[PDB]
């Protein structure tokens, strides 16, 4: 029994519009926690807008935003959960125009 734990997530990251942004985050937990990326209470699904992609391995999750738009700026929350507990962290993503 090991509750999930997010290793580290930056509080803030900046990116120029028209670029690709990737944010990778390590985690632990036994069993492997389920991974949720969300925007204001709503789970983000891989391929949304043909630009957002999420890839999860056993100890690393990656959020990919291709061709970054001004509307993409905002708070993105990573949440982890298993039978032993949950962990959650938020990154504020700022777009430079």
């Amino acid at each position: 029994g090991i509750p999930p734990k997010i290793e580290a997530l930056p509080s803030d990251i900046s990116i120029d519009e028209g670029k690709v942004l990737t944010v990778a985050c390590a985690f632990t937990g036994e069993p492997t926690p389920e991974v949720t990326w969300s925007c204001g209470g709503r789970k983000i699904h891989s391929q949304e807008q043909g630009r957002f992609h999420i890839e999860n391995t056993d100890d690393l999750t990656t959020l990919i935003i291709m061709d970054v738009q001004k509307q993409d700026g905002g708070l993105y929350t990573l949440s982890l959960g298993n039978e032993f507990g949950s962990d959650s962290a938020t990154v504020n993503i700022h777009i430079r125009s």
């Binding site: 997530l9 690709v20 990737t22 944010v23 990778a24 690393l60 990656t62």
Partner: protein, 94 residues
Amino acid sequence: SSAPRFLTRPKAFVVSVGKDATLSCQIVGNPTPQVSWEKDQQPVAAGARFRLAQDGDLYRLTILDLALGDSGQYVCRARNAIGEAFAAVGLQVD
């Protein structure tokens, strides 16, 4: 031609009751990305206690003679013409 990517999770290595730490990760991109480390939203610059090195796609930050003030979150930033990749790792000095 391709945005940067972390092939493996950034890792912070320290021995119990140790005086030195090493932080490393494997990053790829085309063109080869410029890699830097940040702590407290300020770049980490090379000096007597902070050592930066590269060996192919593997990038390292070694911290010598650890002080309590070295504790915190280190962000690794990889950038090229196509995009940027970010990944953070924590270091707790006791």
